[PDB]
DNA sequence: TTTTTTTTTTTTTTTT
């Protein structure tokens, strides 16, 4: 028999009772689906976690979906409870979903997540066939739905339908009034007639679901649509995004018929159209709510489009690196280029809610117009299939990129960022979606010229990439940070490390003195230096923090199209559901390191000589940068270009890695008893793998 | 040159080590302030004092604000260590504040307080300019502040401002509701509209800064403002008190915006106003925290 | 005592 069935029979007739199971045999996790925790008593002092998770264990005989007790949510937060792990259940309890007629829900009250399972069989049947239903929904609570395991803007599950194709509708007997006319007469007329518009901007999803509120699929997406008489902001309400979101895209002629015109929202701004001729309507807004007969939205095909209507054409503000160099800040633009680098999918905490996160990742889009790549801060645009599976050597096109500039720092910062109404599309060979635009044709011409010339731009994927480089002087660094939180204590650092969540990144500043720096030939005369101060105070340290370890996934690795899937999966966000690995995968140490140096280990003794720490120094600058003076100092972590070397062909005479390592060690030795201000980078790679890499050493 | 300079140069390179000063020269106390003793280990059976003291001993040349070892607070409880006295420091130590960029701090660890000085100079320069920063703050801690020397219900220091003046806020399109309106509708109002209240009673300050919890300006004052017939016990939190307490007098017409509404604190005792005709709303209370823009509190 | 941010809302009259 199966441990699942044994436990179920053991605790089936004692609902909501904590019962240690008779026998504990490891079970295999196969999925972790997240959803909102609702219908629980929030009066409790430890406010219930905002979200709860369902774990789909398997026992070799049957696989059953379990509801993890929210008290254990920290395990999923730190990615300890992965997919395909050998967890052992120490406590179990039953629970009946009164909103449904089914069986008990095995509740995992206590667990001991272990190691990976060598036998991950997804062919096992489901003990409770209700669990194996086509629409994958949460165990508890009416018509509940699942959210993306990490962020709230990524569509996830099966409710997100993608089967809305154009339909031929005859417009005879239809009025299709102009948007300006509607703006004039939306406060008097009763039956708002039809509208023929074209989507010009599609924005990310917005999850406004709150606990203990009678809300069903609380999603809203903002669409800007334009006709021959202006443009308006169209908003899709809950229960409509699931059916239409994955299908609606920019450039689709829609026929909205039964809508609701409201006064518009003052806390949300309407993006300016690419073509200024389009008159902007700001006093009006169109709300699309799900209706009984699904006719409120119709995707009119292009073939039916008549020039007589003169519908506005989807334009684009495509920009090239050279042009971007001359564009003021906050000047929206579009970028088409070749992905020559992709970074980890890091996460940041929303400033509004402490339990929500943004998923972002840095990518160096590049073109033939300049020698520097577009640095784009790619936040999730509710396009997980493209965002998660993005790889170098791909023609990438984003839609709405706000320009961000900072000239105070000596390394002038010029990186683009994705806006709310942005979009991501991967292009293939000649411009697939945007061939007509001349800039796309020029980019394709450059691609062909490079291909026939035998030149290939260097490619990288993943790694430790703290793009924003701290300024050259601590005063300028602190000009933005508050005085009370500017610095921390070497002792308090431990809590900072222990507070981060999956891929949450943090930057802290610590006051101390470099005591001993050691060089670790990383890839496959003096490498260690010790300070007399260290030899004296090493025996009187209260707590010597040891975080000078570099993980294999923090080393950027040169991309290889053949191992594309493996390389991508080694740096994406943790998948929600297990998927068996094709054949055997290679070793993450089997790929060449895009870096060009070995990592050092820096020991810092606090100003009071009581506490110490061991950070790891991971410079990303090549010796050519040293020779041409593209680095503020040898103790920094980035060259000014903030980009990896391209087709390195000039290291024949330049000092080798060992010479640069000796220079770095000597520079560190120059700071013997000097109170320096280190800038550390704390990133938690999940599964209790927190990397603490040094960024900059601000000397007096 | 000076005793201060000699001792500091002697003990700068040995933080958290106790060294008898090379020379013991009487030094005049020119100031004595009191602040919370957080960041100390509360695991010792003799729990360290809830407050520590900073003494601005002055030599003939300079005066450098020092730190009094909490074990010496007995000399201040009896007022034996007062301003204007002459004392002979016997033990010193160097401590570095890890939340500020600055030089070492002299840690007084044993004194022999004598008698009043014959000549006290208030014009002696400050050796360390950091000590001379106009918004005076305690030597230890990041955003710490000095309390009053003896009682905790008296504003003290430069954090307390009196610069607030009446402002002519236009009421062209300001949505002003009544207190009873919130009383009936405050659990459904996603946004709480503006208010136009008038102060009736202003309470004495209350310091709730415990040593272990990390709080900034643990100052809290309860103001009984009454808009229209209704009256509620508004309560200002955190660092809002030392920006509006020395300025707000009873009878000032306040315009509170971007506020919060919650349940009345269980042990709260709302005072009855002079006029009985008013309604004493005692179910919900408006909390005024420091919003990033300075529009939350505007007096008309 | 402490404690912040976010959106959601459907419907049968007028003629002068």
Curated annotation (Swiss-Prot), chain B:
GO terms for cellular component: nuclear speck; replication fork. Residues 186-289 bind DNA. Changing residue 268 to E: Decreased binding to single-stranded DNA. One of its GO terms (molecular function) is single-stranded DNA binding. Changing residue 206 to E: Decreased binding to single-stranded DNA. Changing residue 285 to A: Decreased binding to single-stranded DNA. This is RPA-related protein RADX. It comes from Homo sapiens (Human). The chain holds residues 43 to 342 of 855 of the full protein.
């Amino acid at each position: 028999r199966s441990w699942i069935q044994k436990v179920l029979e053991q605790i089936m007739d004692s609902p909501r009772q904590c019962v240690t199971p008779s026998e504990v045999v490891p079970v295999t996790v196969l999925a972790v689906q997240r959803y909102l925790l609702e219908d629980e008593p929030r009066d409790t002092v430890p406010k219930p976690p905002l979200y709860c998770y369902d774990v789909t264990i398997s026992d070799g005989v049957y696989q059953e979906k379990c509801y993890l007790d929210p008290s254990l949510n920290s395990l999923v937060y730190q990615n300890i409870l992965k997919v395909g792990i050998q967890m052992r259940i120490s406590r179990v309890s039953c629970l009946y979903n009164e909103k449904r007629i089914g069986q008990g829900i095995l509740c995992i009250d206590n667990v001991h997540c272990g190691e990976t399972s060598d036998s991950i069989s997804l062919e096992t049947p489901f003990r409770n066939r209700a669990h194996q239903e086509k629409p994958e929904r949460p165990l508890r609570g009416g018509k509940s739905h699942y959210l993306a395991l990490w962020n709230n803007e990524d569509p996830y599950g099966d409710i997100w339908l993608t089967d809305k194709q154009p339909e031929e509708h005859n417009f005879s007997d239809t009025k299709i009034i102009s948007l300006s006319h509607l703006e004039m007469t939306w406060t008097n007329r009763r039956n708002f007639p039809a509208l023929l518009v074209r989507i010009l901007h599609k924005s990310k999803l917005r999850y406004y679901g709150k606990p203990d509120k009678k809300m069903i699929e609380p999603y809203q997406t903002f669409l800007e649509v334009a006709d021959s008489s202006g443009t308006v902001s169209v908003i899709m309400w809950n229960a409509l995004c699931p059916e239409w979101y994955k299908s609606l895209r920019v450039g689709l002629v829609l026929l909205l018929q039964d809508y609701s015109v409201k006064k518009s929202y003052p806390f949300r701004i309407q993006p300016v159209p690419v073509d200024p001729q389009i008159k902007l309507i700001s006093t009006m807004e169109i709300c699309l709510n799900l209706r009984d007969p699904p006719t409120n939205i119709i995707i009119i095909p292009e073939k039916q489009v008549k020039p007589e209507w003169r519908l506005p054409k989807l334009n684009h503000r495509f920009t090239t690196r050279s042009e971007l160099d001359d564009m003021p800040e906050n000047c929206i633009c579009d970028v088409i280029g070749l992905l020559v680098f992709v970074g980890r999918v890091q996460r940041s905490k929303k400033k509004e809610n402490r339990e929500d996160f943004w998923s972002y990742r840095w990518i160096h889009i590049a073109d033939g117009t300049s020698e520097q790549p577009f640095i784009v801060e790619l936040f999730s645009t509710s396009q997980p299939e493209i965002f998660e599976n993005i790889y170098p050597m791909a023609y990438f096109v984003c839609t709405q990129l706000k320009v961000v500039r900072n000239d105070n720092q000596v390394p002038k910062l010029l990186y683009l960022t994705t806006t709310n109404e942005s979009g991501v599309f991967i292009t293939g060979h000649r411009g697939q979606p945007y061939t007509y635009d001349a800039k796309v044709k020029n980019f394709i011409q450059w691609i062909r010229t490079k291909s026939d010339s035998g030149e290939q731009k260097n490619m990288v994927i993943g790694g430790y990439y703290p793009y924003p480089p701290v300024p050259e002087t601590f005063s300028k660094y602190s000009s933005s940070i508050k005085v009370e939180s500017l610095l921390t204590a070497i002792s308090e650092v431990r809590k900072e490390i222990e507070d981060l969540q999956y891929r949450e990144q943090k930057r802290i500043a610590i006051q101390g003195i470099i005591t001993a720096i050691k060089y670790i030939p990383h890839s496959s005369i003096s490498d260690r230096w010790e300070s007399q101060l260290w030899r004296e105070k090493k025996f009187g340290l209260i707590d010597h923090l040891h975080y000078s370890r570099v993980y294999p996934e923090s080393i950027p690795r040169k991309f290889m199209f053949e191992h594309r899937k493996f390389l991508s999966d080694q740096y994406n966000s943790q998948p929600a559901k297990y998927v068996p690995p094709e054949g055997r995968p290679p070793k993450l140490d089997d790929f060449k390191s895009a870096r060009s140096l070995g990592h050092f280990e820096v020991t810092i003794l606090g100003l009071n000589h009581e506490i110490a720490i061991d950070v790891a120094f991971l410079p990303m600058y090549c010796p050519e940068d040293i020779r041409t003076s593209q680095i503020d100092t040898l103790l920094t972590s980035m060259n000014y270009s903030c980009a990896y070397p391209q087709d390195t062909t000039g290291n024949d005479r330049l000092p080798g890695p060992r010479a640069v390592a000796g220079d770095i060690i000597k520079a560190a030795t120059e700071l013997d008893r000097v109170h320096i201000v280190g800038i550390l980078d704390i990133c938690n790679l999940g599964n209790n793998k927190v990397e603490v890499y040094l960024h900059k050493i601000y000397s007096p």
